[PDB]
């Protein structure tokens, strides 16, 4: 992703 | 515009459409006084006018001067009842009216009389069309189609029977024997009984007569198109599936069939469904005795015959076979179910293998294969698809074993072909089967109209007249509505895919696309369920109920593979041996078969024979004005006549014109100058080079003003001869 997770 | 005192008119009546009236007063401009019993008549923004006896008899609906439904119907009535005479021409078209009694008019001396003759020279008779075909093939090497059309009573079979008897009897001459022997078979598999009447060829039927390079029959080749598969599975009330199933059922008592355990037609689900187990026409065993004779004579051996009856007994047994359902997604056959076991005993296959593949369908992508349970409804629809696919392959096989017996030893130089197809139709419940019939008819009327417009532009060319305002109605915008993307068939087949689909939701899509966007499509105010199509003949209304169950065909390839495995007899595995076709749905298969038909037709120049039931309840050789108007509108006759009346309908040869009248050198200008004295406007008629071309009224206008001048000469002679002679008589008395 961009925040709460690695992607 | 004119009415004299005692100028007769046709006026409408509901009971019987047209009645004459004596016009007892000169009309001037809203109520009018007329006698049949005398009643005034009232107008809004006008009665049509009645041809004099000089015209009324005539062979030729174009020659009539007042062109309208009353005049046409009156001629056909007097020509049918009062004159015992069978045929008429309208434009390029012959029109045929069922005499329903067997007549001297068909005979070999008269066949020979018609030979080497051209349609104008001698009376309308079916032979004249076959002559124009033959002579065209002699003139210009194109292959001739002859087209026979109309409601199921009209005798399209017996007309084609004569049209073939003609070619064979002239040619030099064994074709007739085989071709006429074949019809008991092709009707027995291909004819059906309906609420209206009880022989109806649902498939579309084509014979090619092949010819030698010197012209004789080499032989014949049959084809078929548009087979209405759905009647096998599903039937309306008072209606039956193809006769052969009932022939089997009546035979079942006989010892040979005994293995097949065939019961009564009411007992089997497919024959049960129409509620019409027994019929006036035949004890069906008697018909099959002639079906079997025709097979044996046409070279289908008993070994094949018993195979065919084995297959049909299979198809009748399959209907009996009925699923418990475990679960929404699941169907089961009960642990013994008798008809499936008997069906397997007929065709030599494992009970377990059908039982599994009937319930489940296979899916595979190369990594893995999967087997799904499916609902009871998909199990039904797949069983019905299998029954249809089997039937339609048995049919496409029998048509080849007939053709094997039928073909010539040798290559045809060219052929002439004779085609029997059901006409445009209306019923008082209308169903996808009728939407198919009407669609095929409209797509043929497109070719009819094109051939009309072309032959008229030729006839205007070869003798010159200005060529604009040569006109025809165009049906193509309705065809586009049916055929195009988001057309009525296209949404039907789409909703066959869509996850839960129903007649109601299909109609709701039809309304949302067409309802007030497409001029030819309409809704009946009182119903959501139906819709109205503005066909070329008429507006027609179709009930959407049970389209989709008829529309939907797909066959699980496993189920057919199980049959294609069978050892037990040659025929069953043979049929299929010949996928995407299994994907395809009765509407799309009909569309394609209809394209194959119109390609085989358009390669060929037409000739047209149009055939009406004159009668209802089979009373011989009497006539009903109610039926014939419906029939004739359904044949595009009234279209053609309306279109002609607008323009330059009538033709007069100057030679006949002067032989008819001397009432006022060189003949062409003599007749011109006479007509200029008689007529006041060049726009109102035209001069061809052999012909003269009159606008519709002008022939009757001339006939009346001529008859009036002749009457004035009559009265002057009668007066002067009475003056001289009756005076002489009383003076001789004076002596």
């Amino acid at each position: 992703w961009x925040a709460x997770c690695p992607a | 515009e004119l009415y004299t005192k005692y100028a007769r008119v046709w006026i409408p009546d509901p009971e019987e459409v047209w009645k004459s009236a004596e016009l007892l007063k000169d009309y001037k401009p809203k109520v009018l006084q007329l006698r049949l019993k005398d009643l005034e008549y009232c107008l809004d923004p006008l009665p049509p006018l009645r041809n004099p006896d000089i015209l009324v008899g005539e062979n030729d609906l174009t020659a009539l001067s007042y062109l309208h439904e009353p005049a046409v119907l009156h001629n056909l009535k007097v020509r049918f009842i009062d004159s015992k005479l069978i045929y008429t021409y309208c434009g390029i078209v012959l029109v045929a009216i069922n005499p329903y009694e067997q007549l001297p008019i068909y005979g070999e001396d008269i066949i020979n009389a018609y030979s080497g003759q051209n349609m104008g020279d001698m009376d309308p008779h079916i032979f004249a069309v076959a002559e124009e075909a033959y002579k065209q093939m002699a003139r210009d090497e194109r292959n001739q189609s002859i087209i026979v059309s109309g409601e199921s009573g009209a005798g399209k079979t017996v007309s084609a029977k004569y049209a073939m008897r003609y070619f064979a009897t002239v040619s030099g001459s064994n074709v007739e024997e085989k071709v006429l022997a074949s019809n008991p078979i092709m009707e027995s598999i291909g004819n059906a009984k309906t609420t209206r009447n009880d022989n109806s060829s649902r498939f579309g039927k084509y014979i090619e007569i092949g010819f030698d390079k010197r012209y004789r029959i080499i032989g014949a080749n049959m084809r078929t198109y548009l087979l209405e598969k759905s009647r096998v599975v599903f039937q309306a009330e008072e209606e039956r599936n193809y006769h052969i199933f009932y022939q089997l059922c009546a035979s079942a008592a006989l010892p040979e069939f005994k293995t097949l355990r065939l019961g009564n037609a009411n007992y089997f689900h497919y024959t049960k469904q129409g509620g019409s187990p027994v019929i006036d026409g035949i004890d069906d065993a008697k018909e099959m005795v002639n079906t079997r004779q025709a097979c044996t004579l046409l070279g289908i051996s008993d070994s094949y015959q018993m195979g065919i009856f084995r297959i049909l007994a299979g198809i009748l047994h399959l209907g009996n076979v009925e699923f418990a359902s475990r679960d929404s997604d699941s169907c089961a056959i009960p642990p013994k179910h008798d008809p499936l076991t008997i069906f397997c005993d007929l065709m030599g296959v494992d009970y377990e293998e059908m039982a599994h593949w009937l319930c489940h369908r296979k899916l595979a992508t190369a990594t893995e294969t999967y087997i799904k349970p499916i609902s009871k409804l998909h199990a039904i629809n797949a069983r019905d698809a299998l029954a249809k696919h089997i039937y339609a392959n048995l049919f496409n096989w029998i048509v080849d074993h007939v053709n094997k017996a039928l073909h010539s030893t040798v290559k045809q130089h060219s052929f002439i072909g004779v085609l029997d197809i059901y006409g445009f139709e209306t019923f008082e419940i209308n169903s996808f089967e009728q939407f198919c019939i009407n669609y095929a008819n409209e797509k043929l009327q497109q070719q009819f109209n094109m051939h009309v417009f072309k032959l008229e532009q030729e006839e205007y060319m070869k003798e010159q007249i200005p060529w604009t305002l040569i006109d025809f109605y165009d049906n193509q915008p309705c065809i586009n509505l049916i055929e195009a993307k988001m057309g009525v068939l296209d949404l039907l087949d789409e909703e066959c895919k869509m996850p839960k689909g129903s007649d109601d939701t299909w109609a709701q899509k039809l309304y949302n696309t067409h309802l007030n966007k497409c001029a030819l499509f309409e809704k009946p105010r009182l119903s959501n369920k139906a819709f109205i199509i503005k066909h070329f003949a008429d507006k027609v209304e179709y009930q959407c109920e049970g389209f989709l169950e008829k529309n939907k065909d797909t066959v699980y390839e496993e189920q057919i593979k199980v049959l294609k495995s069978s050892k037990k007899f040659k025929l069953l595995p043979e049929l299929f041996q010949d996928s995407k076709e299994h994907k395809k749905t009765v509407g799309h298969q009909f569309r394609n078969s209809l394209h194959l038909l119109m390609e085989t037709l358009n390669a060929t120049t037409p000739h047209y024979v149009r055939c009406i039931k004159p009668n209802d309840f089979k009373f011989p050789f009497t006539f009903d004005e109610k039926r014939a108007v419906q029939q004739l509108r359904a044949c595009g006759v009234l279209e053609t006549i309306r279109i002609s009346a607008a323009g330059f309908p009538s033709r007069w040869t100057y030679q006949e014109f002067f032989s008819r009248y001397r009432v006022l050198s060189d003949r062409k200008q003599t007749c011109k100058n006479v007509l200029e004295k008689l007529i006041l406007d060049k726009d109102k008629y035209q001069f061809g080079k052999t012909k003269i071309f009159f606008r519709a009224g002008q022939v009757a206008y001339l006939e009346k003003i001529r008859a009036d001048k002749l009457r004035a000469a009559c009265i002057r002679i009668q007066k002067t001869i009475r003056g001289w002679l009756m005076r002489k008589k009383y003076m001789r008395m004076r002596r």
Partner: protein, 372 residues
Amino acid sequence: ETTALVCDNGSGLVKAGFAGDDAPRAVFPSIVGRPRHQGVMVGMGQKDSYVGDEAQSKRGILTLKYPIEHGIITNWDDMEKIWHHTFYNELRVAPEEHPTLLTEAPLNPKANREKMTQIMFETFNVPAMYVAIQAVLSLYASGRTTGIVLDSGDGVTHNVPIYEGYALPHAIMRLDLAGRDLTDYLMKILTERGYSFVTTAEREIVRDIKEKLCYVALDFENEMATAASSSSLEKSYELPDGQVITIGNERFRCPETLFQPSFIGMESAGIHETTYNSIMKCDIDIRKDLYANNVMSGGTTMYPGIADRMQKEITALAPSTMKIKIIAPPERKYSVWIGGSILASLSTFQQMWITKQEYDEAGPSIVHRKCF
């Protein structure tokens, strides 16, 4: 005619075929291979990258990256390779000839839409395109119009209640639990029996263990006690080099993590709870239909017994008045693509496409406005 391309981006697999096919012709992992070593021999084939089944064949020699993690495309240059390989090599079909249909998870970062579109129009010059929410397609595949769809892939788990053609977007729930993170947990717990998998390529050995051996416990704790009491649940599997490994009560413990994600340390409850809790977000009037129409979709659901466990646990949590029914098509891993085939073949759908002209005017923002 022209018949649409239908192409599905998972995280673990790519599936593609033509509309109206019964099942995709190409399936291969969306995995990109790079060497780790010096090339020894001059004259060898010197390849700069491998894609999919090539990278499967050579995985020992290679680094296996995934372009997609949690349904998000993480590096667009290798994604371009994935698509290019799909169209030219697997399908043998130029994209300029055919429109394409592309598949996405429902809450993924909005930019993923623009970029995925831009690559189709600029790079491949596709005639036209559309993008579909997986759960919607699962309903087309199963053949119904009211469903709560649960789907779980390599990348994402989500729920989308759909009532009679209407999706109900506020209900939507998503968990990042997936076939990949069951795999990493499978490595961690396999370590306890002494079998230790470090490299990228080893993960796929683990994943084959997981696919073959695993199953879902119907009572987790009673089977734990049984397997501690008795060996019979233990089962054994062969490493690529031929060493056997033998695996016990632990083989179910990975499927259990979906129900008890506290093992890995998630906040969010197991999929059973989120399923019920998503039904609770809906109106009461619909709920009777959704309790029957539970649809499972995507390959993670394939664990034997996941249906019976789900039904059992949700029944206890449901209001007793309502029956619970669960529907699990045996191919359901494909079902997202089967649905995208049905939907792409419909005539009514045709006007839905984003056409090249329309994109060219609108700019890739158009995807948000038209497509959803």
